[PDB]
Amino acid sequence: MGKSTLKHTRKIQILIDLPTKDEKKEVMDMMYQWRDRCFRAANIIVTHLYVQEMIKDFFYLSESRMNTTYRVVSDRFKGEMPTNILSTLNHGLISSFNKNRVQYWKGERSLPNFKKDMAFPFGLQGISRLVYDEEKKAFCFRLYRVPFKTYLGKDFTDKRMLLERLVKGDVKLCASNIQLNGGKIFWLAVFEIEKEKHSLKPEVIAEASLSLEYPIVVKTGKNRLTIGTKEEFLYRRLAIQAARRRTQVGATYSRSGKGKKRKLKAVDKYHKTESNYVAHRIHVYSRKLIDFCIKHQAGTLILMNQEDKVGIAKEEEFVLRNWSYYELMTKIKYKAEKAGIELIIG
Amino acid sequence: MGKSTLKHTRKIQILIDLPTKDEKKEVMDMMYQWRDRCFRAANIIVTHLYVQEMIKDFFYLSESRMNTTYRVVSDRFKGEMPTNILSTLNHGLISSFNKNRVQYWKGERSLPNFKKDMAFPFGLQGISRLVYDEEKKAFCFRLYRVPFKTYLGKDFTDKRMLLERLVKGDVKLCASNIQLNGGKIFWLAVFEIEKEKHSLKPEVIAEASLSLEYPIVVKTGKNRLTIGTKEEFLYRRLAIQAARRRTQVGATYSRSGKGKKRKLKAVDKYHKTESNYVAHRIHVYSRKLIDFCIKHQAGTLILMNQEDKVGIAKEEEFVLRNWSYYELMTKIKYKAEKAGIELIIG
RNA sequence: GAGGGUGCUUGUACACCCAUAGGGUGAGGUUAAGAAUUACACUCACUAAGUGUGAACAACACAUACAACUUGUGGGAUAUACGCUAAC
Ligand SMILES: [Mg+2]
Secondary structure (H helix, E strand, O other): OOOOOOEEEEEEEEEEOOOOHHHHHHHHHHHHHHHHHHHHHHHHHHHHHHHHHHHOOOOOOOHHHHHHHHHHHHOOOOOOHHHHHHHHHHHHHHHHHHHHHHHHHHHOOOOOOOOOOOOOOOOOEEEEEEEEOOOOOOEEEEOOOEEEOOOOOOOOOHHHHHHHHHHHHOEEEOOEEEEEEEEEEEEEEEEEEEEOOOOOOOEEEEEOOOOOOOOEEEOOOEEEEEOOOOHHHHHHHHHHHHHHHHHHHHHOOOOOOOHHHHHHHHHHHHHHHHHHHHHEEEEHHHOOOOOOHHOOOOOEEOOOOOOOOOOOOOOOOOOOOOOOOOHHHHHHHHHHHHHHHEEEOO | OOOOOEEEEEEEEEOOOOOOOOHHHHHHHHHHHHHHHHHHHHHHHHHHHHHHHHHHHHHHHHOOOOHHHHHHHHHHOOOOOOOOHHHHHHHHHHHHHHHHHHHHHHOOOOOOOOOOOOOEOOOOOOEEEHHHHOOOEEEEEOOOEEEEEEOOOOOOOOOHHHHHHHOOOOEEEEEEEEEOOOEEEEEEEEEEOOOOOOOOEEEEEHHHHHHHHOOOEEOOOOOOEEOOHHHHHHHHHHHHHHHHHHHHOOOOOOOOOEEEEEHHOOOOHHHHHHHHHHHHHHHHHHHHHHHHHHOEEEEEEEOOOOOOOOOOEEEOOOOOOOOOOOOHHHHHHHHHHHHHEEEEEO
């Protein structure tokens, strides 16, 4: 079933917030050792859990589920590797194996050997002091008593204000991972955002137009969305017309005397299919327009129409022509009134 | 004595020799079943081998095999499929894993993942009663007590002599496989064919360069040959790419509600068309290069990969990019090793 | 009219067909609505295609010029192309 909360996966840049470069090098090598031990532990856990699962087929093997494996790996790596990271890795791998057990038994998928370059996971008990510093103009935190800062760069994307509510507590932080790539340290962070009931805000405006290059163009707030293309909308129509043309040409050069209905029923069918295709196109474009209005909570929509240059002359042609091409005004009004959107014709 | 033979893979189409279509469909269904069971068995083989290796590593750090893997795949798939396929699959996977054991423990490689669309193996013990039939104009042979006839058609020179060599026993067959594709059965045979003897003078050197506005330019002495044209490699491929992009844009409102396979049914054609086209053009160029080497009795050919102005800045580009674009070096190696011509890189 | 079928596999063209094939469906899954029912770049699968004989959507026979022929496969909305498999 669809969960009441959505999940967003992002990749922010985490950097050592320490003054001395020697401390930075120490933290870097300790992170690298962390990833090495994480790989070794993860491979050992996945193979051991496979052995415990496949006790039937391992007859030739010469001699809850958390405790034995986690403790064995712990005593193997006590003092040289943090314990909560092992706990998070073990929990994640057991979740994955419980998910893919059937596939592994049937033989569809082989056992994925986690390589040395795995993005090593970390739990909630490891991260600390996740607060936004205005003096540094960035987010800062403490991972396992190691200071760290965020270098989001020239990012205008959702990550910044995601972290804003995250430090504001509106978002629960899931089991996230630290990835190392080419000396760059990223935080593969999974945020759980509660799906608030999107209330159609009556005060925010939306403008929809019948452009020349795109059939529907919609503008709402600081976002613009194009709906289809002339080529996409016209490919099937051109195919239908070409089929009609070749059928008529073949019939005109075919054998007569067998009835005119047998000669033109294909042409009539092709005409009907062309009309039905355009109707389906109108339906799907209107559906996407209303859907975009729903997700942006645009409670007010205007069909800004034609009027431009105070009565300008006729151009080449308008894709979807006017608002009354295929009852398009009616279809949009219908889907709006079922959605809960007031409509103002323009 | 050194190896005087080079392994070559051949695709021989095989039709099913039963009178009516009910038996044909039954045997085709059984053959699909064979392929599916082979993929499952191969995956289980790889998982078991990796688990064995990691358990050995675990036991070493804390403080026969072929028979075992063959036995486990047997008892998992006895009676539903022939037995020779599983043994050859076992032996091949064991050879590959014994070769890559160090990398797999270290972690620089990912464990193999076999899918439902693989060729399944069979050894030289599968072919029985291989004889040319005069009434049916085909070679007939029984593979695991299943009759099969060869569909060569207009191949009165190439594969008709290689298989006529097999019945006499002059040419040896290594392990083969079988591919199944859209109602067609293909046999992928690995033949050990001796190298041709040609009059080659090692003193004469034919210079070939991956440069110019042509794909590969070769010359020696005073003769020159340009292998292919830009309009036949880059521009034609750009047409496939542009058609694919148009199809991808047009697939957002293609037939929806039927999964991503059908919504992308038109896109997938151009991914195989472009791959096949480039693999054929590289084949033709790689053959037209070794052809010029053979024609003037060139004993060794030099491949100068760029090396322009001893490390100069990047120009726009020259066709074919580098000397391993689409296995052009990997392909040139075998056409040189068989011919006895030495290959020089630079 | 693109693109496909048949002409051993791959490529170019070629004769005959198919082609709204970016289409027409079916099964499973998720979702909303009081319902009809919508949806699903969710999973999976089916379906058109040479000539003569032949009752037949059985089968058989016939069915082009040029070159290659170390292979199979996964991912790829705007990531520039990456990885798995056999062999030397
Ligand atoms: Mg064909």
